[PDB]
Each structure stands twice: as structure tokens, then as C-alpha cells.
Design a protein around this ligand. Structure first.
Ligand SMILES: Cc1cc2nc3c(=O)[nH]c(=O)nc-3n(C[C@H](O)[C@H](O)[C@H](O)COP(=O)(O)OP(=O)(O)OC[C@H]3O[C@@H](n4cnc5c(N)ncnc54)[C@H](O)[C@@H]3O)c2cc1C
Ligand SMILES: Cc1cc2nc3c(=O)[nH]c(=O)nc-3n(C[C@H](O)[C@H](O)[C@H](O)COP(=O)(O)OP(=O)(O)OC[C@H]3O[C@@H](n4cnc5c(N)ncnc54)[C@H](O)[C@@H]3O)c2cc1C
Lengths: 656, 654
């Protein structure tokens, strides 16, 4: 087996082994990714062969099998929980285990009392119970405060009654609930003392532990097929309705709020703000996965673009690899750039998480709004860019990209729910907006802004500066780009606050000015990404030519963005046409330098073929023969005559 | 029997029946769509229940049966060609019949001598053969001049020998090829008399008519599974490979090029320019289909946005329909304006086809390079926007949009190939760019330009003019928007062209400025759309409030694009910030007007629930109970214990 990309690899002008380390985040991280990776990859029992053609029932049985087998490797190899996270990542199949570890345990941890965690967590850690997280209902997803499921305390019996008063209050979506889960944390409105104390979490057992039949009064099942072959279809997303299901009182999560023997709401010390610590963690984790999906898609389109030649024969010559084209470059390299950018904004959130929970331990709350907005904005930004980027990578692969065996169709189907869970992307950006608008109106009060909105403390200036770019290369110097993003955002937010303040009723004004508020929120998020990329570049970072390439990636991301939203900077006045053109010319230059390195830079993600499952992105570039061999395995190819043909088509050929 | 959307219907400020007419295109068009669609929709044999969950063997079987049942009704009802195309559209199921009618017949027709169309077309017209169109190879899609499949004439035997020299010469993608077609038009390099004469089409029998087994030399099958549940997996896209298959001399389509007994090449002396069939008609068709897909998505998402409520309870009241939100509006309404806009260009394209086939049949080839780019650029534009709006429409439906049974996942998976077949979108827009660059660099002559580039007969003016919008409503006036877009296109092209003349060789320069060129191409295309819209509004349009509703959508479309590409209006100097904002304020106002009509505007597409196959988009707005009943039909709900459980999960628990 030759490496048909050995020539593209040679052309690299940096140390891939160190790039690997940068992508991974640390030597520890890389060591762990690499060993768990290859260990998932070279094990018969984790094969994805055939997965896309299974009917839902065998797909699902097959998920269960892999789910069990993986648990068994976690045990037999004494992997830590960190390691087990990795192991499941590389198995690469949505399944209940994702929610049990991913949401059910974190909910108990964050919201159960000391006692509650002692009781429920050992069970969940050994999977003597399997739990999911039931919040969304038919009729409520984003608006959590409006859920209809009720939990009504019963003083006569020391139980809550969980009830679904209506069809639409039915739970709908929660993964692992359809078929697998034995228990759920069920969010419902607490009704006690004939008053509504709002939404809380209840640990409700859904099925008998002996035979897995649903308990009395509980109705549970799966909701239906979702988008794509395989994808989330291996996940049992559930509908769940309750008919006065009775639960003991100490099954309410009582960390923050509790209910006495007699009813009556009570509140502990231990601040409800403690929970904002878990926002940051989850959002971080989701931004991390954005860099993961973007990197997988970019890795396939890139390798495919180096191998795919089309046009540009010159006399008898080989045709031009499509990656040599500047239009292929203009759609592809910003996505590459984005994977490294979102990778780094990912690390910066790791830090932001440590900072917030350092402050949470001093009962320091001055930093929380900013932390919340910063994470909402970043989750939104990165999950759109990524969803849009994977469709773009498919398109960049031309017709072959439409084939399941290319890897991109699944990767898009699986990825896209990111845009709606743990916050609708657009709904999160109106939150970002409100906070910027808030941050602007507190200036009058003399309240000086911090973290990621510390730039808004310098508006007088940002309102009136002009870029001073004289040559394309100046767009390379960080202070030029950073200021350019700061100005844009300040100006856009200012323009919103001015526009907004003409409304007597502020709620009216948020409604009417929503589209622009979002446009402002986007600009701010973009600024966070760029400014963190620049911050990253001031770290050391070993390995020959590594930093240098990462600078190239920086420029591309921020200048791609600058061109896309070019009106934003020309509006306000911050840059002139010539200057916009100079940025355009420098992005063009940057594409030409990235070119030799694209394949090496996606080689840096260190993915196996098993994990990638793309014939178009095979490491060795042996694409076409693989696609040919692959077609000869579709069900239709079992014979030269399709079932149906003699019955329906033959008669008509001859007429009958 | 209750319509949850009546309160929205009653808010209409226009005659829906007459908007229906407009959408369809004429009372004749309308009476025809309406009768054939109810026909399909109300016939159990065209049901789509359960499709999406079928394994592939069974989905294919069921395709073959629908196809045959379709042919049986076309015949029993004495349907014409136009009605038959209609019927096949409302069956809503990609199938071989679509290449046979859509590409095999029109290629013979187009590229064959009269003598040849006389022996083949009757055969294909009664479906006594089943043809597909085999151009694309593993290694060559866009680049038709580099297909590797060869066609060597054997003088010693009066035959061409069609051969697949290499694995990557394998024919790959043609639908109807993989299992059903008995013949193909196979495109191959003509090797004759020792010289290579480029691509040509050859009628080749793929399979024994008596028993359907492949003929000696031929290798065919399906290529595998494609994006999305159902969608195109009901189509057998093929791979076909040849070991020197033999074929009579009269199976080369000998209309434009001929080959004589003794070998050797003669040309008909009948201008290969006649192939507007090959372009304007087909691209016309893809553009029409873009409006068709955009309108389905926008229809599901408008209805769903008027049913779904979330937030906005003030004192324990009802939550706000999401359709009242400015962000929903700004994501949804330009999509709705686009369907109407792309619908109207599509009309204008019929005109162009009739104008071009009048001219071609006559003696005038001059209008032709314009007709070519114009249509290329529109295929590109409308398909890109449509594939985007469909994904955007799914996002508009929130979590519920992720379910197959919202209708949207399929609609996206089956539409999106449009961006790649008959011309890759960016490749197509690189061609508009050449034509524009050509149109400039020719101006210094004398011979002023025409059609969709006559605006470049006035570059001098548009190189210097500047907007005089003094308030928001000014952007309503047709002259301001047109001039806004002509100024924009003219400037971008001039800038590209100026930038390019700086190169020693034009090819290197073209390679290098490619993104700026495409960017300029898209601008030229937006102008076309916008200006055909304006012209549409010069027409008699009957019915109360129809024309105003259309004016509103027209503004929406132009100003949404205006805001999105505001850099291009601002940077060239055309407008000032204030004017820019004024454009943004007017767009708001427009959303607010469109609001009460949004649901009636999509009612005017007149789609049945059967066609639309979306619970979220049900005419009657009864969404949630219907989702809930759908869930129970999934095979996982066939019992309470999943297969898998006791074998794998029970021991893990205990
Ligand atoms: C694959 C998948 C897995 C999931 N798994 C789980 C799970 O395990 N547990 C669980 O509890 N849930 C789960 N969910 C539910 C999910 O977490 C989200 O809560 C759900 O997708 C929220 O979407 P929605 O339908 O309510 O969007 P909506 O909020 O109803 O939004 C609908 C549309 O209206 C717009 N809109 C809504 N509000 C506003 C506003 N105020 N202003 C402007 N526009 C607005 C939105 O932008 C969107 O366009 C899952 C969902 C999916 C898709
Ligand atoms: C569903 C489907 C059905 C099809 N059915 C048929 C059929 O029935 N019959 C048939 O003959 N064919 C068929 N095809 C083939 C199809 O019509 C196209 O011709 C083919 O998909 C063209 O794309 P490609 O794969 O050649 O992309 P390529 O041209 O290889 O492009 C790959 C990438 O390279 C880029 N690129 C290529 N050239 C340039 C350039 N010069 N400048 C800048 N960028 C460039 C493209 O933009 C794209 O990003 C079908 C394809 C699909 C997806």
C-alpha cells in the first residue's frame, strides 16, 4: 500500500509531532488520546462496518452490544473516568451512555445534597442503574421556566406526585429514555403548600429493576427516526408521560431548595450560584466538541482536495488538484483556521472554568454575568460555524461527498442538534445582547467592565479611531486586527444601545431590534475568538515552524471574518475601501502560504481511519479503488436483478 | 375537523385564490397542477407512509412498483407529456423514470439524426426501453473534456468499441443505471482514423431485453447509500464499466458529428449551437425546481412558526408564537421572498428559452453567450440559496425539526445534490465571471451590450453615481434598488477587471483572483433576480392586494441581500452609513407588514399534506397530537423491551 499523499506530506514546513501536541492541548492529553484512540480502533468489537445500513432494531441491538462491550473494557483495563470519556468518544456512536455520564450524573452531583449523592452516585458509577435527563417537553424546549409537568407534595404520605397534566407536557427528546434508562432526573414545577415554587429536579424510577417493564402510571417510548442514516438513530430519544406517579420526598434534589416533612419551601446556605459553575463546564465541553467535528470534516475535505484533480491539464499534463484553486481555498482554509481557533477558545474556557470556580469559593459573584454571556455566545458562535462548515466540506467534495461512505453526511446529521441543545443558538445570542446592552448602560453609573468586555471601557476612543493600515502585511500585526474587531463590536453595540434607548418600554425595544442585537452579539463573540487566538500566540509553544503556521491560521480566521462581514467595519468608518482591499489581498497571500501545509496540519489531529470512517479522507489517499470496492457491498448489489424488477418492470418493457 | 390556523388565515389582506394563480403561472398551469396533485394525493397506491423506514431492498421494490403504477395511470388517463411530468413530481420519489424522461429522451432527441430519433424515440416513448444518461466517471464530473471512456471505430467491422481503460473511467452516478436501465447514452472520447475527436454520445444496450442480465463486456451496479433516510436511495445511481463492448456505427448520435463506413469524420453543417435544449431548458428546469423546494421548506416552517409558542407569557397568558419574533422573521421571510423571487425569474427564463429557440432556429447566435452565463449564474444562485434556506428552515423548527417526520431532513437530503449536478455551483459562477470580464474588455470597441449586461452600456454613469435615499421608504422605489444593484455589479466587475490587467498572463491572474470573480458573479446574478422581479411588477396582476403583497416580498428580497452584502454597496462608495441603516429600517418595516400574511402566502403554493409529508407543516396546524401518534409507529415501540436489552444491558445492571 503506497501513501498517495506522501508528496503532500513532504512539502510540510513544520514539525507535525509537535503540532499533534498543540492540538491535543498537552503531552499528557496527547499520550491519552493516542493510546485510547488506537485501542478503540484496533478492536474488532468496535467496528463501524455496516452500521449505516442496519434497520433501526438491529442498529439499536448493535448499539447495546457495543455499549456493554465498552463498559467491559473500561473495567477490564481499569481506565479512569477521564479515560472512559475518551474511550466512549472513539467508539463514536450516540447512545444512552452519553446522557447517563454526561447529564444524569452531573445533575445529581450539582443538585443533590451530601446524603443524596452518597446514595445515588455509587449506583450510577457502577451502572446498577441507568439514568437519563428529562427536561424538554413536547411544548417546551428553550423556555424551561414554562414546563408543564408537575410535582405535587403530599403531606399525608411524604411523597411527591409527578403528573403530566396534558399531551404537550409529555417529555420528548431526552436521550436514553426511550428504551434503556431505568431512572431519570425529571424537571417539573414544584407545587407544595398550595403555591408554585418553580422548576426542580426529581429522581424518578421509570422501570422495574427486575424486568425493565415500566412502573405503574408511567408511559415511555422512543420518538422516531431522526435525520440521517445511523447518526442519532442509535440513540433512544424518549417520550415520557406520567399519571400521578408517586415518589418519596428525599428523591427531590434538595441541595439548594428543600421541602420539609410537612410541605413548606426552605432554602439552604450553599448559593444557587454554585450551579453557574456547571454552565461553564458544559458549554466548554460543547465548544470542545465543535472543534472536534469541525476538525473531522476539515480533515476529510482537505485530504480529498489534495487527491481530487479537475481541470487545468496543460498539454499532456496531470490535471490540477482542486486544493490548488483559490476558490477551494476560500471555502476550505477558513474552516481549517476555524478548527484551530475554536480549539484555542476551547482551552481558554478550561481556564475560565478554573477562574469562575475559584471565585465561587470566595462567594465572589462580580464575574458571573460576563462568564455566562461569554459562554453562551461562544457556544452559539462555534456551533453555527461548525454546522455550516461541515455542509461546506461536503459540498467541497463535489458529488462524491453525497455518498454515505464519504463520512460527511453522518457527521452533519450527528452534529447538527448542537445548534438546539443546551440552548438554541439564536436564543443564546439574545442573552449575549442583553448583557452587552446592560454593560453599556452601567457605564453612566461609573461601573467599569471586565474580562471579555473590558474593551467596552474604552468606547470614547473606539468610537473615533481609524485603522492605520498602509500595507497588507500590517493586517498581520496583532494590535491592528484586535483593535479592528474591538472597534467594530463597540461601534455595533453602541449603535444598538442608541437605537434601543428610543423605546419608552425596553422590552418593546428588545423585541423590535432583535436581528441587529444578534448581529452585535455575533461581532462580540467573533472578537472573543480572535482575541484569544492572539493571546495563545504569546505563549511559548515548541517545535520548529509550529507557531509560525499557527499565526498563518490566526490571520486567516480573522481576515476571513473581516471580509465576510466587511460592511461592519466600513460602516462605522473604522476602515476605508483601500484598507478592506488590503485585507482581502493579505488573506489571498495567506491562502498561498497555507497551501503547502494543509495536509500536514490536518494530519496533526491524529485521527485514525476507524474514527474518521471516510473513504474520501483515508490517510493513504487511496480513494477511488476504495469507493469502487465499497459499492459492491450495498444490498442492491447482491444480484444483477433487483427485487421488484420481474414483477413490475419486465411486464411494462414488453407491455401487459 | 378543526383548523388551528384559522386565526392566521383570516388575517390575510389579499385574495389567496388569485395568489395561487400567480404562483402556478396562469389559470391553465393552475388548473393543471391542482387536478394532478389531488389525483396523486388521494390514491392509496402513491402513499408515502413508512418509506423513510424501509430497508433499501424494499424501498427499491416499492419504487419500481410506484413507477409502474404511475405509468399505468398516465396511460389509463390519456395523460399528456406535461401532465405526466406533473404526475411524476407529485409522486415525490426520485426514480429512474426521471432520467429516462428527463435526460435520455432529450439527449437522443437533441443529439441524434432524424433517422435515429425515428427508431429510438418511439421505443422510449412507450417505455419499450429504459434509458439513462451516463456521462460522469469516478474521476471526472465537472471536467467533461477529460472523461477517459473511449469509443474506437473498427473499420474492419462497422462498429465502435466502447472501453473503460481504467478503474476511474468507470461511469459513476447516473441514476437508472444501477439496476433498471436497459440502455444508456454513454459519453466517450471518439477515437477514429487515428485521431481523438472529443466527447460524443453513443446509444448502448446495457442489458438483455429478454432476461435483464448484463450483455457480455458490461459491468453495472448501484454505487451505494446516499445522504439521508429514503431521499435518493430509491434511485439506483450506477457504476458501469466496459471491456471493449461492441456497438453498431449508427448508435453514435450522428446529428452534429458523423462517422462514415470507411471510418473518418464529417460534420453535419448544421450549427452545434442548436443545443439550447441542452442548456436554457434544463437550467430553466433546475431553477423552477429551486422555487419548488424553497417553497416546500418555507411552507412547513411558516406554519410551524405560527403554531409554536415559546416565551412571552405576560401574567399567566399564552406564550408568543415564534413567528412574531424579529429574529424568526429575519431568518424566515427572506426565504419566503426568495421563493417568490426565484419563481418569477423562472418565468422570465421560459421567456428567454422561447426567445433563444426563436433566434437559434433563425439566423442569430449573437444573444447566445449571454443566454449561457445568465442561465449558468441563475442555476448556481437559486440552488445555493435554496439548499441553504432548507437547512435554515429546519433550524427554524427547533428540536422538532430534527425528526424525519417533520419533512425537512428528507427535503434537504434530496434537494442538495442540485448544487452539484449539471454544473458545480462555483464552477458555474467562474463562467459568469469570464463572460462579465469579456463584456467589459470588449466595451472599448463600439458594439454596446444587451440583455442582462446592457447595464454595462452605462458603466461611466454607474461608475460615478451615488444613492439619494433620504429616508427608509425611499428604498421602496424600484429605481433606487435597481440602480443600487447595477452600481454594485458594475463596480465589482470593473475592479476585478482592473485588478486583472495587472498580470503578465491572464490565466495566472484568473487563477489568482478567482474568489473576487465569484463574488462579482454572485453580484451580477442578484441583479438579474432583483430586476426581473421589478419587471414582473410592470405586469397586470389581478386580485385584491396581490400586487402589493408581491411588492412587499420584492422589497424584502432586495434589501435582505442589500444588508447581507452591505460591504459591496458601502465600499464602492455607492451609499453612506445612514442610507445603509435606512435600508435596514425598511426591511424591519417590511417584516412587520408581511407578518399577518405569512401563512396565507404559503397557502398560495396550494400543496396537499401528502405532497408536503410534514407533521410540523400540516395544513390544519394540529402538530403535537400528530407527532405523539407518529412516535408509536416506530419499530422500537413495537414492544416495551428493546432487542438487545436482556442479552447486554440486564447483566450490566445486575
Ligand atoms: C438530538 C437532540 C437530543 C436532545 N436530547 C435531550 C435530552 O437528553 N434531554 C432534554 O431535556 N432535552 C433534549 N433535547 C431537547 C433539546 O435540548 C432542546 O431543549 C430543544 O431542542 C430546544 O429546542 P426547541 O424545539 O424548544 O426550540 P424553540 O425554543 O421552540 O425554538 C423554536 C424556534 O423559535 C425560535 N425562538 C424560540 N424562542 C425565541 C425567542 N424568545 N426569540 C426569538 N426566537 C425564538 C428559535 O430560535 C427557533 O427558531 C434534545 C434535542 C435534540 C434535537
Ligand atoms: C445525486 C446525483 C446524481 C447524479 N446523476 C448523474 C446522472 O444521472 N448522469 C451523469 O452523467 N452524472 C450524474 N451525476 C454527476 C453530476 O452530474 C456531476 O457532474 C458531478 O457530481 C460534478 O461534480 P464532481 O463530483 O465532478 O465535482 P468536481 O468538479 O470534482 O469538484 C470537486 C470540487 O472541486 C472544485 N472544483 C472543480 N473544478 C474547479 C475549478 N475549475 N475551479 C474552482 N474549483 C473547482 C468544485 O467546486 C468542488 O468543490 C450525479 C451526481 C449526483 C450527486
Amino acid at each position: 500500500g503506497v501513501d498517495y499523499l506522501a508528496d503532500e506530506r513532504k512539502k510540510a514546513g513544520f514539525d507535525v509531532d509537535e503540532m499533534k501536541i498543540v492540538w491535543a492541548g498537552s503531552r499528557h492529553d496527547f499520550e491519552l488520546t493516542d493510546r485510547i484512540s488506537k485501542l478503540v480502533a484496533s478492536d474488532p468489537g468496535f467496528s463501524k462496518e455496516g452500521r449505516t445500513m442496519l434497520p433501526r432494531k438491529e442498529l439499536f441491538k448493535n448499539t447495546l452490544r457495543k455499549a456493554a462491550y465498552a463498559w467491559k473494557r473500561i473495567i477490564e483495563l481499569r481506565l479512569s473516568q477521564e479515560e472512559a470519556t475518551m474511550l466512549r468518544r472513539y467508539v463514536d456512536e450516540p447512545a444512552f451512555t452519553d446522557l447517563h455520564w454526561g447529564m444524569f450524573i452531573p445533575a445529581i452531583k450539582g443538585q443533590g445534597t451530601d446524603k443524596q449523592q452518597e446514595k445515588w452516585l455509587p449506583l450510577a458509577y457502577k451502572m446498577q442503574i441507568i439514568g437519563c435527563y428529562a427536561q424538554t417537553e413536547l411544548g417546551h424546549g428553550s423556555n424551561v421556566q414554562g414546563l408543564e409537568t408537575t410535582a405535587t407534595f403530599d403531606p399525608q404520605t411524604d411523597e411527591f406526585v409527578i403528573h403530566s397534566p396534558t399531551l404537550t407536557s409529555s417529555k420528548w427528546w431526552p436521550g436514553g429514555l426511550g428504551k434503556v434508562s431505568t431512572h431519570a432526573v425529571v424537571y417539573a414545577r414544584l407545587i407544595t403548600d398550595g403555591k408554585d415554587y418553580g422548576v426542580n429536579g426529581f429522581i424518578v424510577q421509570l422501570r422495574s429493576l427486575e424486568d425493565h417493564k415500566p412502573l405503574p402510571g408511567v408511559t415511555v417510548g422512543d420518538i422516531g427516526m431522526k435525520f440521517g442514516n445511523g447518526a442519532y438513530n442509535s440513540m433512544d430519544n424518549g417520550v415520557l408521560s406520567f399519571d400521578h406517579v408517586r415518589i418519596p420526598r428525599d428523591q427531590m434534589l434538595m441541595r439548594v431548595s428543600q421541602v420539609t416533612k410537612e410541605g413548606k419551601y426552605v432554602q439552604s446556605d450553599i448559593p444557587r450560584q454554585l450551579l453557574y459553575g456547571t454552565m461553564v463546564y458544559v458549554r466548554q465541553s460543547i465548544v470542545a466538541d465543535a472543534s472536534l467535528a469541525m476538525s473531522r470534516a476539515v480533515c476529510i475535505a482537505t485530504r480529498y482536495s489534495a487527491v481530487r484533480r479537475q481541470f487545468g491539464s496543460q498539454n499532456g499534463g496531470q490535471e490540477t488538484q482542486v486544493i490548488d484553486y483559490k476558490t477551494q481555498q476560500n471555502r476550505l482554509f477558513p474552516l481549517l483556521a476555524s478548527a484551530y481557533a475554536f480549539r484555542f477558545v476551547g482551552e481558554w474556557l478550561k481556564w475560565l472554568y478554573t477562574d469562575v470556580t475559584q471565585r465561587l469559593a470566595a462567594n465572589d459573584f462580580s464575574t458571573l454575568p460576563e462568564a455566562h454571556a461569554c459562554t453562551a455566545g461562544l457556544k452559539s458562535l462555534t456551533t453555527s460555524a461548525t454546522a455550516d462548515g461541515i455542509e461546506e466540506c461536503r459540498k467541497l467534495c463535489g458529488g462524491h461527498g453525497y455518498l454515505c461512505s464519504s463520512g460527511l453526511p453522518e457527521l452533519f446529521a450527528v452534529y447538527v442538534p448542537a445548534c438546539t441543545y443546551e440552548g438554541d443558538n439564536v436564543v443564546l445570542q439574545l442573552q449575549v445582547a442583553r448583557f452587552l446592552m446592560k454593560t453599556i448602560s452601567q457605564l453612566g453609573t461609573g461601573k467599569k467592565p471586565v474580562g471579555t468586555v473590558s474593551y467596552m471601557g474604552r468606547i470614547e476612543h473606539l468610537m473615533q479611531c481609524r485603522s492605520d493600515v498602509k500595507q497588507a502585511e500590517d493586517w498581520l500585526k496583532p494590535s491592528a486586527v484586535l483593535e479592528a474587531f474591538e472597534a467594530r463590536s463597540a461601534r455595533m453595540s453602541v449603535a444598538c444601545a442608541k437605537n434601543l434607548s428610543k423605546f419608552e418600554n425596553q422590552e418593546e425595544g428588545f423585541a423590535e431590534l432583535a436581528a441587529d442585537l444578534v448581529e452585535a452579539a455575533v461581532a462580540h463573540c467573533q472578537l472573543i475568538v480572535v482575541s484569544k487566538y492572539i493571546e495563545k500566540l504569546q505563549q511559548n509553544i515548541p517545535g520548529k515552524g509550529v507557531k509560525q503556521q499557527l499565526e498563518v491560521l490566526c490571520g486567516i480566521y480573522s481576515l476571513f471574518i473581516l471580509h465576510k462581514h466587511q460592511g461592519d467595519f466600513l460602516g462605522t468608518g473604522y476602515i476605508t475601501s483601500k484598507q478592506g482591499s488590503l485585507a482581502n489581498d493579505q488573506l489571498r497571500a495567506l491562502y498561498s502560504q497555507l497551501r503547502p501545509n494543509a495536509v500536514s496540519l490536518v494530519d496533526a489531529f491524529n485521527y485514525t481511519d476507524h474514527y474518521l470512517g471516510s473513504i474520501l479522507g483515508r490517510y493513504d489517499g487511496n480513494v477511488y479503488p476504495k469507493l469502487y470496492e465499497a459499492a459492491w457491498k450495498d444490498p442492491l448489489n447482491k444480484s444483477d436483478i433487483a427485487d421488484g424488477f420481474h414483477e413490475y418492470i419486465r411486464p411494462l418493457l414488453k407491455q401487459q
